[PDB]
From a paper:
SARM1 controls AxD through its enzymatic activity. It is self-inhibitory and is activated by nicotinamide mononucleotide (NMN), resulting in depletion of the intracellular NAD-pool. We have documented that SARM1 is a multifunctional enzyme with properties similar to CD38, a universal signaling enzyme possessing not only NADase activity but also catalyzing both the cyclization of NAD to cyclic ADP-ribose (cADPR) and the exchange of nicotinamide in NADP with nicotinic acid to produce nicotinic acid adenine dinucleotide phosphate (NAADP).
Library screening identified a derivative of nisoldipine (NSDP) as a covalent inhibitor of SARM1 that reacted with the cysteines, especially Cys311 in its ARM domain and blocked its NMN-activation, protecting axons from degeneration. Also, dHNN-inhibition was time-dependent, but not Nam, strongly suggesting dHNN covalently reacted with SARM1. Indeed, LC-MS/MS identified several dHNN-modified peptides, among which Cys311 in the ARM domain is the dominant one. For the dHNN-treated SARM1, larger octamer ring corresponding to both the SAM and ARM/TIR domains could be clearly observed. Extra electron density was only observed near residue Cys311, the dHNN-target, but not other cysteine residues, consistent with it being derived from dHNN (5F, purple). dHNN interacts with Glu264, Leu268, Arg307, Phe308, and Ala315 (green) in the ARM domain, pushing the insertion loop (red) toward ARM1 and stabilizes the domain. This is similar to that observed with NAD, which binds at the other side of the insertion loop and stabilizes the ARM domain possibly via ligating ARM1 and the insertion loop. The Cryo-EM structure showed that SARM1 was locked into an inactive conformation by the inhibitor, uncovering a potential neuroprotective mechanism of dihydropyridines. Chemical blockers may well be an ideal tool for turning off the NAD depletion. dHNN uncovered in this study is the first compound ever described that can block the activation of SARM1, revealing a druggable allosteric site and can thus usher in a new approach for therapeutic drug development.
Numbering used by the authors:
A (entry chain C): 56 to 201
B (entry chain B): 56 to 549
C (entry chain A): 376 to 549, 561 to 705
Amino acid sequence: GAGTEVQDALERALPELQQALSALKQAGGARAVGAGLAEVFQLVEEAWLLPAVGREVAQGLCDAIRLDGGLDLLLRLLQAPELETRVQAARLLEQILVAENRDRVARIGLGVILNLAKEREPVELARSVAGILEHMFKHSEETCQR
Amino acid sequence: GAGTEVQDALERALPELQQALSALKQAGGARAVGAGLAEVFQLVEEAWLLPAVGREVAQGLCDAIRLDGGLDLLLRLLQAPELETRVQAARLLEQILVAENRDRVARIGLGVILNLAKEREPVELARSVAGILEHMFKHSEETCQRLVAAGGLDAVLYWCRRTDPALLRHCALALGNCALHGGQAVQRRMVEKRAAEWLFPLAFSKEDELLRLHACLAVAVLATNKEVEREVERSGTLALVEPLVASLDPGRFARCLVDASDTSQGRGPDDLQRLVPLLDSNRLEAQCIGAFYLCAEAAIKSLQGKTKVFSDIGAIQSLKRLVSYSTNGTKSALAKRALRLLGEEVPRPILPSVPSWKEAEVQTWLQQIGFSKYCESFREQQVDGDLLLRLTEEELQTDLGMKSGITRKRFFRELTELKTFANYSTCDRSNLADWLGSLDPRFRQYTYGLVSCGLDRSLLHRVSEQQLLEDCGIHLGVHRARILTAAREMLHSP
Amino acid sequence: RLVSYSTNGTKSALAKRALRLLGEEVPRPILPSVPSWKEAEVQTWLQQIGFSKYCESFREQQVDGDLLLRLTEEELQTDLGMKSGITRKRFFRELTELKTFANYSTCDRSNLADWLGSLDPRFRQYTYGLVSCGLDRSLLHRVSEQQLLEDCGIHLGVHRARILTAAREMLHSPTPDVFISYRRNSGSQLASLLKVHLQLHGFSVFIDVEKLEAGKFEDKLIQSVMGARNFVLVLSPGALDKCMQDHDCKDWVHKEIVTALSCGKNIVPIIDGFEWPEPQVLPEDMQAVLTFNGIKWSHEYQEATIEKIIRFLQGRSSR
């Protein structure tokens, strides 16, 4: 049913996240951001989970998260003064870099990741930013040079 | 109704101006001249105003103003003792210079404009005479020679100081057109007068982007020339090209440049061939700016049916060659976007490790450079990367099937272009590539010829000239002589 | 032929008018940058000189400007199809007529064209032959006669002899200084303009060029401000409001003050459109700047203002 579900899996995942991704977007609550973050993280851990369906449901979903104007939200929240919102935003950013989103991140974001590379102590930060650098070394030769 | 109104628009505009242009022609009234001036200025601001009709109604009207004997009236009133009649006459003269009237102005008027170039103080004077010089730099090379040799450039470089948001656009376009259609001598005398330094306050203003675009275009055209690129790089204004191009969108400046100058469908063919020679050069800023302008023009000209001028000029082959050897993110993006706007398919970038290639990669290479009809012979003889890097003329002539000498010379030209780009990390030992490229950028193309024979930086001090003629494959005697004289010195001296 | 190589307005006009009086069509002038030509322009050239029946062979072999400037007799005889020696000699005559007219601004480096044309007007036709091989005015003093026979393509022995004897004679016989701090919002214009006005008098100067929204702290800008001899400050209207009682790094103009003042160098303020405030709107480390005095900028006698601001630096004892 994989050749059938290419409309069906995307017609049951975008329905809810399509609002929830911006449901809490302007709220400057300390503990408010974490809930939506966890929600989206659960969904991207759901797309990959079910076998033989997870490739297209993951890639089209990630492309929709790119097209919805949410990367700039992540790039903002990476510079927030609180630390647990930073680590949750990083662990969510780890799971989105596929071959198309990585171009946009290499276009705009590249400086904030280097700014995060100075913070060494919190382990959940390092565990995700190491994977971010892992995925970002595969893009181009100029990116590796930088 | 544009194909109908070519009689109808001219049968409702000439009716009134045809008398009003000379209605007040002999009157020496101080305040009398201004009324007719304003009247005509209103009409020429009416012709351009209404869209999709303004091109022919403007050009034929201007031709009729030329044929009516009114240019001499303007050239008289430019020398009048009163000042407000001078500024109104100048602002009217700005709006008439089209490709035919400009010849007559360059014939007769050229001295009075230079006489006006001394008056710097009244701003409405400078705002129009800057546009007059802008339009007059596009005529010929002799006209540019005169305007640089009679002090008409000093005016522009002094007016670069002021802070008017409409004077500086004319100033930037003046310097750009002068460097573009000027020639060699005018460029040297431009860079001698520190024009590269004065472009920096014009490109650093963060108020508008059209000023930055025209300033970067002017500095790129000046930096394409090889003789004075050292001065321009010492000026330090080339470093401000990359951020600007990287932080814009061609799609939004498309739907711009369609209303500002004359509401036209872009720049002409002979204007478009002024960008392609700066698209093929060993500079990065120049290539980026060229890519930007071509992308924008392609956007504007692909809505229409004219999709053949970019093949007549030869921008398709240059853009594909720009994509294939892309060592940057910005110009590669712009190039791919500009090729996507046309029907030409996008090429893929090629791996820089030229040795250890296989037959497939060689085929794709021959598919991107243009030698697509010889792919069969290569797939037949099973040529690879190694066998490609060591080809000679005999194998081309005999079994690969390149009979004509001009095809062989094209092939070698493309090949030597490719061999300065490759990565010799798996063959070289003592980094001989770098030691060659230090002498001359063109000297890297022989490095594999040296490495596959077995030389390195410890074994070059005792090689002969004959030993480089057939073993390593260096044909030009000058190149052999320089390699020998630069290596024989180096025993352990550097 | 007079129209095609027209370097004047009068004779070109008269020529076009005289051709218009006859049934012959008017040719178009050709661009003087002969390298970086394409196939179309080559075709029009062959349409104007008279070799109009060989256009097919050129469009077939895809000859361009570069491949035209380096043609030899063999390619004419073999595949381009000029069998007779008299046609080849006409073609070379027209070509050498064209090559003394071209513009080598994008290939030449040391202006070798001029040094050739000084010997003889007919000697410019070989300049591309020299440039594409790689020679220049520093590398001609050690070339041979054989090395000009096949590499550069000079056939007449007299010409080689004169080039060698005229070149072999000629061996040689014929950290920034100051810094400029300025508000990113306003005062961009007078900062750029002060930069160019200082640089034109022989002083080096380094200005901030779009560092923000990136790595901002210790990002190779703090040694610059301590290794620069003289310090400059741009007082735009409403330029000191953001640093009023914040004493943090978000005030991008603060750090430079706190470091240039630690070093103890000359800080010249530029007074324009604004005067100093009360001394309570700035912290304890910023009470000194409120007391300094500087130059009053004007948009009328800028040259005098520069002539006066030179002395206010350490120009007496710089460098």
